[PDB]
Design a protein around this ligand. Sequence first.
Ligand SMILES: [NH3+]CCc1ccccc1
Lengths: 127, 338, 236, 57, 285
Amino acid sequence: QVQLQESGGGLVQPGGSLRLSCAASGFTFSNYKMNWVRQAPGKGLEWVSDISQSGASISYTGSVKGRFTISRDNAKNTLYLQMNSLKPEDTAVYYCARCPAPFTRDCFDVTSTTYAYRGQGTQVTVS
Amino acid sequence: ELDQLRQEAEQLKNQIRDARKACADATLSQITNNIDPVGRIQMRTRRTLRGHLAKIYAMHWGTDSRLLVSASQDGKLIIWDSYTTNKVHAIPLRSSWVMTCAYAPSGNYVACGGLDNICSIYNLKTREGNVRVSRELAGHTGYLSCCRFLDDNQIVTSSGDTTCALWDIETGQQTTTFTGHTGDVMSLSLAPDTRLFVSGACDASAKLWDVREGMCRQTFTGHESDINAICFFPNGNAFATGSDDATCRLFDLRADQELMTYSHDNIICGITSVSFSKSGRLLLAGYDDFNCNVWDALKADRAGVLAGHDNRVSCLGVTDDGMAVATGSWDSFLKIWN
Amino acid sequence: VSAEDKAAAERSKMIDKNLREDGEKAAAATHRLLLLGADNSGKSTIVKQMRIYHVNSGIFETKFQVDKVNFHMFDVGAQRDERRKWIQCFNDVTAIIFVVDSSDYNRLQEALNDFKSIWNNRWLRTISVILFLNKQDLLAEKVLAGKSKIEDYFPEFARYTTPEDATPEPGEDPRVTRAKYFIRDEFLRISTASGDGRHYCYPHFTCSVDTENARRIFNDCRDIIQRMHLRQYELL
Amino acid sequence: TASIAQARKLVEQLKMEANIDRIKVSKAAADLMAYCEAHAKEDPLLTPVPASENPFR
Amino acid sequence: SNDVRASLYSLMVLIILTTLVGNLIVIVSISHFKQLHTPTNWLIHSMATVDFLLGCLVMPYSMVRSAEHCWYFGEVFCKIHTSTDIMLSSASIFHLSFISIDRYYAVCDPLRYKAKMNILVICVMIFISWSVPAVFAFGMIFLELNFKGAEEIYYKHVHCRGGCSVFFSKISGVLTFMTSFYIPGSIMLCVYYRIYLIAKEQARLISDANQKLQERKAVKTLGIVMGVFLICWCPFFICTVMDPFLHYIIPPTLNDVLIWFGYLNSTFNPMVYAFFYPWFRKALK
Ligand SMILES: [NH3+]CCc1ccccc1
């Protein structure tokens, strides 16, 4: 079965740092791209970052550009998101979501409400 | 109590994993490693059915194993006579976004559906002699990806709203609605006894449904991406599936889990359609690489390639008597193999 | 040879003749366009005079003609959020009409991601994209007000200067011109990063009251098909 | 209470999937092998038919 | 010399075989595949069959008259052969002009290409290119005398040839030039220059946009087409139209070499117009 379980999260003061690690099982981690999405209270899912198969191509949302760092560990089948210098505007539930088809440069429905290949979620709160 | 519920669900999942592992005493691969290989399977295009001016999206054979229907993006539903390549009928469709078609076992009715979210039933034996819209089965909230005829009055249609519905044609209402999928349902296969059917979906989950009680009986996992095709084994105790991960997998109803992975390192193109031979020894699949590959179900060893399609193969079917295999593709040609 | 066989053959011939007649009719000088956008984007108001609503069961089709050439525009607006499966049906279209609400910066990144997915899709990599940055009027009002800064949603705006090839209206302010051309360049960067050379992006700045959208689509389709013919004839 | 209701429905579905009986995988594979070997002769795709037998010639 | 007679005969037989095989392959491909049944490919097939006939019906006698010899065949036959040669050369050139017109329409009128270039107008073009050259050639050879007032000159020229080189008077020469070479040639030149301009502008725009943000294929294609046509036919037709003037001082050997360049155009035409494009290559695969 294909399942994704994130880690990290908790209560952190503004300017703090967190490590969000997502564990992947039941599929080949190298073939698929990986994305991070978050759900602010009362808001829809917002794409945060993205990484390609080799890890060379990385893209970030403008709000989190320059602070968040995304890393992929193919050998350990895990994905990371270093949240450096975060602010209380970042309080949301983070989901690790692979892209549907392997060997593809497109990711259509990663932010969709019922996306099948997302994760359960990690609550990150900032005060 | 949501967390408690989730923990209970996880415990149930662990129990189900531990049970099939106990069941998995051995593997079919080592069970049938001693049997003789089928050898190289070679098929040559016997009749090419030309006449469609656009990409063919779906097809379905007839129980007589002579007449077949086809659906294309040009807006025409064409019923063929593969023996002599005679276009018996050419039904015009209101919407050109057809995604599926079916041929009733009695041969009197032919169904089609697509992005119009409506299953259209076409009468082929009416007294007037002209094909007429029998019923418009409306009520789905997503594109119709597949539909199959139980009898002249009941049809099972899968949609893109993560549901499968059973329709009563005479009254045009959903007798029973099947729910549980978290992704768009893309294909369905009915059982030889027409009491059970499966529905591959976009969540990599293939479910087994009871027609009468309207409940899922089993859920199958194994695939790592969107499932586009699914076809019951002739016995009815197993099915195969085709996914976007360029892998076909065989699931057994009684054991509850996968028995075979039909994939190769070379293959990187998803499967659009799968079908079985008469005896189930051959599993024919249609890929996006413009080719259909025939696999030996028992030994997962490739047996042949049905090359000869210029564009992507979108549909494939094997006759009830098993004599011929029809492959449709986006090059507007439907080829018959034997 | 037999009477039944001859009857079947003549029925097949009549069927084929009718099919060929129907294929020749209404399919010559007719082009299909797939219209995409979001709720805020004014995708339904792109073509004003000849907007055709033909809604029955989830797809309304808009038909218009500019110079004896007909265009059929299809807007699928009753499916679920997921769209990676139903969009493979629209491979044949000559162009994709992508409408973007440039006024709202919050969903601009979502629109850019959607454009990126459509551009790099396997079945849409041959189809050119016609891009409409709607609500230019609103975008100008937001920029002139200055209460919301586009730098927050895109930090690269601080180190961006308007291109020399910009052709702003005399009434446009330099800030507004820079903002709109920055959005256009943000889309064009995605376009040209993976532009295979067989499909191109045509960016147009549109407003709701704009009435030249049909002519712009006409010219863009002319360019798309001309370049397709040149590529087929080894001229490009 | 939609999330908890959906989770409870999922739990009930998982229970209904778990409580059913299962057969051994060796038995299932033997069943499919026996079926394939019993219907091998009738299959025309496995064994090529004579040039006059096939209606598609 | 006998030894060189053999060399020239071998070369001319090689030309005949390559012409025939190329034309036959093009014709059979466009017929059987059914995917090459677009209205244009029909023009290409018609040009291929004009040229194939030229390979068997005219070219073999062309070599026996090029190798300076008495015309073994009858006088009625060389009249027929001369008329057939003129007919098929003019038909090929007309087909080239019509293919150029089709290309223009496809490039400069993309949206209405199917409406303005359909099977009806294509068949009208094929009929024109098969009939008007035939009527003109057969009339001017049999009914109307191309030699007007130069009956004396005509007999001396024929007797000096040995075989039968195409004789033309001043008016007849100018009319043949304009009807066969200049008009289709000028049409082709204008339509390929226009296409060049359009394709170069498109390539420049594409490259300029790419460079602004953060192969000369048309030159090669149109150069091959125009250069082959102009090389194979322009020398022959200029010499032929200038032949009535200068009191027919043109050396006989030149004419024999020049006619064979014209035939080498029918040789090269299937190559340039079918194999240079990939779709035909994929079909041949
Ligand atoms: N083989 C070329 C024969 C010819 C002579 C004069 C005009 C056209 C053609």
